Design an enzyme around this catalytic site. Structure first.
Site, short mmCIF file in Angstrom:
data_model
loop_
_atom_site.label_atom_id
_atom_site.label_comp_id
_atom_site.label_asym_id
_atom_site.label_seq_id
_atom_site.Cartn_x
_atom_site.Cartn_y
_atom_site.Cartn_z
N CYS A 1 38.71 48.09 40.71
CA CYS A 1 38.20 47.20 39.69
C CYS A 1 38.15 45.77 40.19
O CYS A 1 38.66 45.45 41.27
CB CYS A 1 39.05 47.34 38.42
SG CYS A 1 40.63 46.47 38.51
N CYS B 1 44.40 48.10 40.43
CA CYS B 1 42.98 48.33 40.73
C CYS B 1 42.26 47.12 41.31
O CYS B 1 41.23 47.27 41.96
CB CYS B 1 42.21 48.88 39.51
SG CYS B 1 42.07 47.84 38.04
#
Ligand SMILES: Nc1ncnc2c1ncn2[C@@H]1O[C@H](COP(=O)(O)OP(=O)(O)OC[C@H]2O[C@H](O)[C@H](O)[C@@H]2O)[C@@H](O)[C@H]1OP(=O)(O)O
EC number: 3.2.2.-
Length: 248
Positions: free
Chosen positions: A158, A76
């Site tokens: 992320c 991520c």
């Protein structure tokens, strides 16, 4: 009759079924960690999302079976988004193999550069024309596919997310693009700390800090309102940049 085309946009890419199947097989060879996928089942789910449906009436729910089969965890913190600068983004991740665009995932790889649509209440693929997003309708098989997969991709991102933008366009950041309309608004501040833009200069146009462009200020405002830090870099020499990414 037969001289009149249904839609304004290009039709389904020739041999679309064979191409999607072959891409799936190839992807599973290059990426053994997606080898569990049944490519025939993936094709069946993909076809199922749009065959026999009116190509202005496609929904994100139509693609959910395909999304399920194509479930894929990529790191991520290693995501590269892009807008209107596909070739350079892909060239980058071909060299920097620890970073991923959406087209480096199975589902994005299957669909990249292709067009498809069906015909209402027939089993046939329309190889003549498909809806143009602007002139015909926005909820078409291609547009809805990218919306669905891009939302999921952005939601999974992320840490530091990077976005490559084309500094030679009249709208460096365009709010109505897939990046602007779907991805930016689905970056989650609970996961994403920073969005860093890389603004790619064209030609010998290296005299301006394009991070001060009004559309970048707009992007900056949108991101700040989501409680995500914004960072921006100029890439003045994308030729030398890529060479350095290859030979650092
Ligand atoms: N008219 C069209 N017919 C078929 N595909 C089309 C299309 N218009 C756009 N696309 C594709 O649809 C996808 C989304 O593009 P678009 O809606 O124009 O906005 P974007 O901001 O440039 O989208 C790229 C970002 O969205 C995806 O998630 C990518 O990974 C990237 O982060 C791209 O693969 C487009 O390919 P393209 O850069 O035009 O070669």
């Amino acid at each position: 009759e037969f001289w009149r085309q249904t839609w304004s946009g290009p039709g389904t890419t020739k041999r679309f079924p064979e191409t999607v199947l072959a891409r799936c097989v190839k992807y599973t060879e290059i990426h053994p960690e997606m080898r569990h996928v049944d490519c025939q089942s993936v094709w069946d789910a993909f076809k199922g999302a749009f065959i026999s449906k009116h190509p202005c009436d496609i929904t994100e729910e139509d693609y959910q079976p395909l999304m399920k089969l194509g479930t894929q965890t990529v790191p991520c913190n290693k995501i590269l988004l892009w807008s209107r600068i596909k070739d350079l983004a892909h060239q980058f991740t071909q060299v920097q193999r620890d970073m991923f665009t959406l087209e480096d995932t199975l589902l994005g790889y299957l669909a990249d550069d292709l067009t498809w649509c069906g015909e209402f209440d027939t089993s046939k693929i329309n190889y003549q024309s498909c809806p143009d997003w602007r002139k015909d309708c926005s909820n078409n098989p291609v547009s809805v596919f990218w919306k669905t997969v891009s939302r999921r991709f952005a939601e999974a991102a992320c840490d530091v997310v990077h976005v490559m933008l084309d500094g030679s366009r009249s709208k460096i950041f365009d709010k109505d693009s897939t990046f602007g309309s779907v991805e930016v608004h689905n970056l989650q501040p609970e996961k994403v700390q920073t969005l860093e833009a890389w603004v790619i200069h064209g030609g010998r146009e290296d005299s301006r800090d394009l991070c001060q462009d009004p559309t970048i200020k707009e992007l900056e405002s949108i991101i700040s309102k989501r409680n995500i830090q914004f960072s921006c870099k100029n890439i003045y020499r994308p030729d030398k940049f890529l060479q350095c990414v290859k030979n650092p």
